[PDB]
Design a binder for this molecule. Structure first.
Ligand SMILES: CC(=O)N[C@@H]1[C@@H](O)[C@H](O)[C@@H](CO)O[C@@H]1O
Ligand SMILES: CC(=O)N[C@@H]1[C@@H](O)[C@H](O)[C@@H](CO)O[C@@H]1O
Ligand SMILES: CC(=O)N[C@@H]1[C@@H](O)[C@H](O)[C@@H](CO)O[C@@H]1O
Ligand SMILES: CC(=O)N[C@@H]1[C@@H](O)[C@H](O)[C@@H](CO)O[C@@H]1O
Ligand SMILES: *[C@@H]1O[C@H](CO)[C@@H](O)[C@H](O)[C@H]1NC(C)=O
Length: 423
């Protein structure tokens, strides 16, 4: 009910057209998806109204496209929000002149409340004048004329939540419309910790997924899925259940994905660099190609999925044996149900080797509500969660969804429920 993905079709702007697509994956939003300028993220921004149209190539998705070469001052922090039952899901990104004097090095960067941050921009144009690094509008750092190095950094020792935000960089004689932008995302808890008091141990996320401080659950990079981000998805896909496909004969090449906040932006698995147009050198494979393969026996290292193990061996480095994993599978779920108003007790049934446990099965209502099982049991090799709805009413009828997520991956199956009242 909350799998929103913003696609920043090239964060570096030039003469070609650039866009921003906000996508709802596997759920009909019940409140308008929003796309616009994030004035709080960066001040002194222009206020031209954005033209937001429906992207007819992805079910539920909205996009903003900027007229080729009419790509005037569109530099700035943007965002696309999704509202689900009172909760807002926000994802942010920025746009900047490709012609820039300094390039951002990285679009966004995530650190822990402890972490000693090191914000850096790469020098592109050599001008004989002072270089400055701002933050939204205020001063942060400054470098003297004849001493502006090949890499312009700001050192943030012991980064705190307040240190998060958009960091600008440019030569003193410039302006906002010509700065380089970088977003620092600071988790409110230290590494592996989560909870209202950072009192809990996160789910170990592999393949560069990050742990959400308010849930302990992982947000995986495009191309992987499963509770711990270890399931390599089908080649050019994205979305929590990997049911979205990068349009184009070139995969997800020129696509930049930004996911819900604790994660930020990055390339899909197998690609790197701003623009994400660069493939990976041998031995690497995750998002922005930061993962180093280490296949214990020299097994193939695929830039998208990682180590390609031989018969009998699973795992990130082909270090495990035993029963091989099986992605969950929703079995025996009708396309329609038709039920009368009153007590309702639906069941979702799933298979898979790591057999879904009770904490991994949920039923999502058309309006986003997420229900947990009330009773549970598993047969020979099928998990069965049973849900209880006090009094299902007529308006609640729509497309409900069974959701199962384990280390073998995640799956969702939709079924249409019709509710009428007995005469
Ligand atoms: C008003 C202004 O231009 N500054 C905003 C400020 O409102 C906000 O508290 C801060 C938080 O990101 O962002 C900017 O600094
Ligand atoms: C096949 C299996 O073991 N499932 C049983 C099912 O027979 C029954 O309807 C339910 C009772 O609440 O318990 C489990 O779901
Ligand atoms: C939510 C949806 O997919 N709409 C269909 C609706 O058109 C159809 O009339 C009903 C019963 O026939 O099933 C679903 O509700
Ligand atoms: C109220 C109702 O259920 N009718 C809808 C009808 O509007 C639509 O044309 C058809 C196609 O999906 O589905 C259902 O028949
Ligand atoms: C950031 O710069 C400091 C200062 O030299 C350095 O000690 C630190 O390792 C850098 N951070 C990293 C690891 O990129």
């Amino acid at each position: 009910a909350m799998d929103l993905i913003l696609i920043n079709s090239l964060p570096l702007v030039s003469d070609a057209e650039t866009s921003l697509t906000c996508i709802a994956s596997g759920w009909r939003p019940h409140e308008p998806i929003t796309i616009g300028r994030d004035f709080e993220a960066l001040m002194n921004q222009h206020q031209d109204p954005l033209e937001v149209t429906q992207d007819v190539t992805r079910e539920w998705a909205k996009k903003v496209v900027w007229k080729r070469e009419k790509a005037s001052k569109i530099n700035g922090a943007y965002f696309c929000e999704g509202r689900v039952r009172g909760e807002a899901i926000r994802i942010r990104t920025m746009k900047m002149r490709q012609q820039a004097s300094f390039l951002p090095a990285t679009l966004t960067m995530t650190v822990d409340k402890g972490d000693n941050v090191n914000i850096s921009f790469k020098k592109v144009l050599i001008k004989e004048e002072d270089a400055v690094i701002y933050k939204n509008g205020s001063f942060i750092h400054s470098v003297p004329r004849h001493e502006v190095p090949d890499i312009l950094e700001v050192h943030l020792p012991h980064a705190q939540p307040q240190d998060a935000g958009v960091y600008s960089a440019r030569y003193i004689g410039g302006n906002l419309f010509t700065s380089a932008f970088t977003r620092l995302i600071v988790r409110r808890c230290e590494a592996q910790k989560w909870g209202p008091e950072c009192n809990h141990l996160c789910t170990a996320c592999m393949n560069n997924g990050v742990c959400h401080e308010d849930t302990g659950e992982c947000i995986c990079p495009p191309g992987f899925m499963g509770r711990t981000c270890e399931k390599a998805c089908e080649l050019h896909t994205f979305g929590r259940t990997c049911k979205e496909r990068c349009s184009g004969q070139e995969g997800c090449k020129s696509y930049v994905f930004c996911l819900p906040d604790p994660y930020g932006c990055s390339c899909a698995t197998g690609w790197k660099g701003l623009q994400c147009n660069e493939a990976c050198h041998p031995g690497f494979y995750g998002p922005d190609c930061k993962l180093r393969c280490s296949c214990n026996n020299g097994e193939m290292c695929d830039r998208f999925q990682g180590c390609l193990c031989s018969p009998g061996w699973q795992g990130l480095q082909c270090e495990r044996e035993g029963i091989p994993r099986m992605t969950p599978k929703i079995v025996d779920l009708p396309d329609h149900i038709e039920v009368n108003s009153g007590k309702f007790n639906p069941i979702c049934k799933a298979s898979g080797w790591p057999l879904p446990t009770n904490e991994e099965m949920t039923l999502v209502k058309p309006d986003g509500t997420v229900l947990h099982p009330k009773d549970f049991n598993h047969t020979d090799h099928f998990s069965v969660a049973i849900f209880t709805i006090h009094r299902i009413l007529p308006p609640d009828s729509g497309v409900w969804v069974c959701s199962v997520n384990t280390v073998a991956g995640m799956v969702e199956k939709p079924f249409n429920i019709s509710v009428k009242v007995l005469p």
